[PDB]
Design a protein around this ligand. Structure first.
Ligand SMILES: Cc1c(CCCO)[nH]c(=O)[nH]c1=O
Ligand SMILES: Cc1c(CCCO)[nH]c(=O)[nH]c1=O
Ligand SMILES: Cc1c(CCCO)[nH]c(=O)[nH]c1=O
Ligand SMILES: Cc1c(CCCO)[nH]c(=O)[nH]c1=O
Lengths: 305, 310, 305, 310
């Protein structure tokens, strides 16, 4: 059975993933940003709606409840392409191969960006309830073998610079959102590591009110929100179970950090040198490769412009 | 390994589902049958404030022309996320304990008040027909439906519309009642169609202009695939965009391995109970993954019930 | 408190770590190969003794028992510099910093090379008992925070080529040893991953006789050796406890794969791009940096030529 | 948290250590005192074949001039790895359960038949004096001595040489007996020296040409630091190579936080027992890290005893 290498380029937007993936006929396929789905297919100018809603919340034109509704609804549209892609690809993924590959599938983001990271950042911006965030978490697809996710590293000033000259249709340069999104992804990397080193959120939970990251430097800190706790301060079981799922989904992910503070050619090599430690899997059928190729190419043609 | 029987009682609201279930639970030994109730407390307090009231108020507002379709859709989509939360989280923590199928007593019987598809497919689809939700959002929810675990037995209910209207009326939105009844009828036909070898892609062109585990193969027009022939999902060449076509592939995959049964609610509560009890005999059981899965499952259900079912 | 980045360049010898580390005044210090300790200080031509002993075992001049004694004794000498370095450095290492660093300490190998990997490979060459290997494992120092280890990737033919032109004093080009050492390091990488993904050796033990690597692709397979089992096939508790330590020591390590199938400049950049995902720690005293620098420079001056 | 008392009975062999320990264990309740015996079975069968016999045969062979110093050193080094295995593995799995120090009854008392330093320092050092081990290998073992956990109470024994020779003689290598007695005397002085503020680096130059927890500061020449002034460890400038100097730093660090006591074995078994029992009163206890650490520790000790102590 042929081998496959899946690479999910994620992290905060505005550092250069697009460029980095771009600089790069049958052995590698690229599933690009589904901008057409966000701007036309799924709804009308989804990014624009998102930034306009936060801006109005900031100005006091709408309430926090109004914003959260908009924001929750918008995230469903944003993640759609990722969720549908994962669902049809799942059955074709077999078990790990071990320490080249028939096919290399490079994706522009993983489902957790839309189901965990963006929503968590919006929660930090006061435009999304923590219950909605855990509801998206509860819907995160099972982590399949060989789930390699590349997160970016970049000093904030440089990030702002880079983000400013590459704004998306309807986007507004919001420094508070940049900080929130950067904080979530930093916590994300720490969480995977925490979990991989044996961290148990239920055992360390008490430390939030008192060789691995401290629970306070992981995504678990965000869920100490008062909306999720009973009158005695205990976490409701519904949410505690959602955190159990988060732990299980994140733990088996393989995280790779890509330094974006270099030229596009540097990033390109950087990324390519990073693939040697990535985990490959076998496919389930002999005709899985071809199907995967068409899926990816069809996705790109229809949603990546 | 000990065996497990999971039964999800679902279908349109107002038929007597909850009553029936509690009567069934009351018959069995204290610990060989557990109930996972309707998470009303999560819907009224924990996830958000009064969700059902908000859903109904939004629709009414839309009907009166006090808000736009867009305004309603954003509220319905967000409300549906909250509505489905408890079902999704329960399925996610139960998943790992479910083993392979065994055969048609068992160590434990888990009766559930609805299945994830109620909140991720059925209500959203009914709201799409009510004009308070977009077809794109409905398909987004469909794509998020968790993998269907082995031994997924779903009991849907049958009941004459005049009796249902009567039973339900003590708002009483009759248009929504008709829409949810139609959606559940489509659902049963969809499973049947899929189990008889039906391929939506092959029959798609037959579109234009119930029994779940018995009968001949239904026409595609009598299944859920007909709801998605909306102009929003169609490209300039007439066919469905691939994004949406893939969502329909997920829908087929998720519903084809389920075991659906129809329970006639047009009888007394005790009749319903005994009818349901008889139906369990042809249902599929599964093994559990660990020896301590049973206890864990009981605790999960009891915990759920205590915190969210009142 | 200043931050520190420790980088242990390890993996099978002969791929180019030396060159890679070499191509690279106060912010980075290099602790080189302690060749002088191996050839003179600790004993006389230790590498030579090692390869001569295997060769004689292969030719049938000495017995397996004779070889194991020599081999065990030799490994104590080989690891000495690493073990003493770790022991005096331990107290200065604080907790993780999180997602530049005051000091970057690049080492030529980590204690597990001499206490786990080489011995395991020699066990595979029939020149070391499995009990001795688990005895070295039991002596592996506690895994401190920020333990980043770089392992190399390189196709076998290329490795042989590279190994052939860079033989060490007294070394003999042994293809059976190359395979054994390459196999151990491949299993090592799989083991860390297995452990990080929740793998439990005691739970999966039964699979050796019947989203993570299968236990059969980890270092645990090597310890199914008959010398370690009781008459009923059970693992003796002494050894089972040694495997518990292995799991604990390996699990919190951060592994990074460096592709050595490129020019030295490529490897150098490759390695440097790999540092962005490495874990940094705080030191315990304000004067820890300076002390660390002198230790490293003193080590280099006395043992690295 | 429950408290724990760990006592390592060590010192030269042939003084009555084992007997004394078993008498002490026999006094306490069944489960408040557990014994971790000498792992003879690991030394005779499990780790290798007959290790002690091999050690003694090698030395004899060396003495007779039937093998070289190099041949003996390779065998002694490898034998010492096997000898220390069970102590090292036990310390590694016990470590995580040990908490901070409490004060001078406790939930559990663990009596050990020797400590890791016996196999990683004392015997190797004695073999160095016997010419069957190199000083470099001895220092390699020293560098591998595990971090000294809190509440490390070590009981060393005192006994006149004529009585010891008598007690030990039913080979009888008197040179080895003298070497091991000297090493243990040096050890006690080393701890004392370190606890009185002694700095080997400051006093190194005083080298040329017992009581563990009492008395004045011993001279460096009466401590273990004197054994390492060997020509093999000295650079051309006269001083120690840094590699070896760092090994001595590890030795100081490891022995300075230990609590050493001297037990007089020149009395009857019951006298020894009561003497030992009285000594436990000034020993340091520690808390355990988890509430279930006690049971785990008991099982570990019982398992160890069953598998390796006969
Ligand atoms: C992926 C994602 C982005 C990033 C898209 C890149 O510009 N932004 C959002 O507001 N929600 C999402 O979920
Ligand atoms: C499950 C569900 C119901 C049924 C709950 C009332 O019995 N109603 C909705 O409006 N959305 C849903 O998702
Ligand atoms: C590190 C090591 C090497 C590798 C040193 C690099 O040439 N070889 C051995 O035989 N034992 C060891 O432990
Ligand atoms: C502990 C030990 C002993 C003592 C065991 C006999 O009581 N003898 C040796 O030769 N080496 C050792 O390491």
């Amino acid at each position: 059975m042929p081998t496959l290498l899946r690479v999910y380029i994620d992290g905060p937007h505005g550092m250069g993933k697009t460029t980095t993936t771009q600089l790069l006929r049958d052995d590698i396929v690229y599933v690009p940003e589904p901008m057409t789905y966000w701007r036309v297919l799924g709804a009308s100018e989804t990014i624009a709606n998102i930034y306009t809603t936060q801006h109005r919340l900031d100005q006091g034109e709408i309430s926090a409840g109004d914003a959260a509704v908009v924001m929750t609804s918008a995230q469903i549209t944003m993640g759609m392409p990722y969720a549908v892609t994962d669902a049809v690809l799942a059955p074709h993924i077999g078990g790990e191969a071990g320490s080249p590959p028939a096919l290399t599938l490079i994706f522009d983001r993983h489902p957790i960006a839309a189901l965990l990271c963006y929503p968590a950042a919006r929660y930090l911006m006061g435009s999304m309830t923590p219950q909605a965030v855990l509801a998206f978490v509860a819907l995160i697809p099972p982590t399949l073998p060989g789930t390699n996710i590349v997160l970016g590293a970049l000093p904030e000033d440089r990030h702002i610079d880079r983000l400013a000259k590459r704004q998306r249709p309807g986007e507004r340069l919001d420094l508070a959102m940049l900080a929130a999104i950067r904080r979530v992804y930093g916590l994300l990397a720490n969480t995977v590591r925490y979990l991989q080193c044996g961290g148990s959120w239920r055992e360390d939970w008490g430390q939030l009110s008192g060789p691995r990251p401290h629970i306070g430097d992981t995504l678990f800190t965000l869920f100490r929100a008062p909306e999720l706790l009973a009158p005695n301060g205990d976490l409701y079981n519904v949410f505690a179970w959602a955190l159990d799922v988060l732990a299980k989904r994140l733990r088996s992910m393989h995280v790779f950090i890509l330094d974006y503070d270099q030229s596009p050619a540097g990033c390109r090599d950087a990324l390519l040198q990073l693939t040697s430690g990535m985990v490959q899997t076998h496919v389930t059928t002999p005709g899985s490769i071809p199907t995967i190729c068409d899926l990816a190419r069809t996705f790109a043609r229809e949603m990546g412009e």
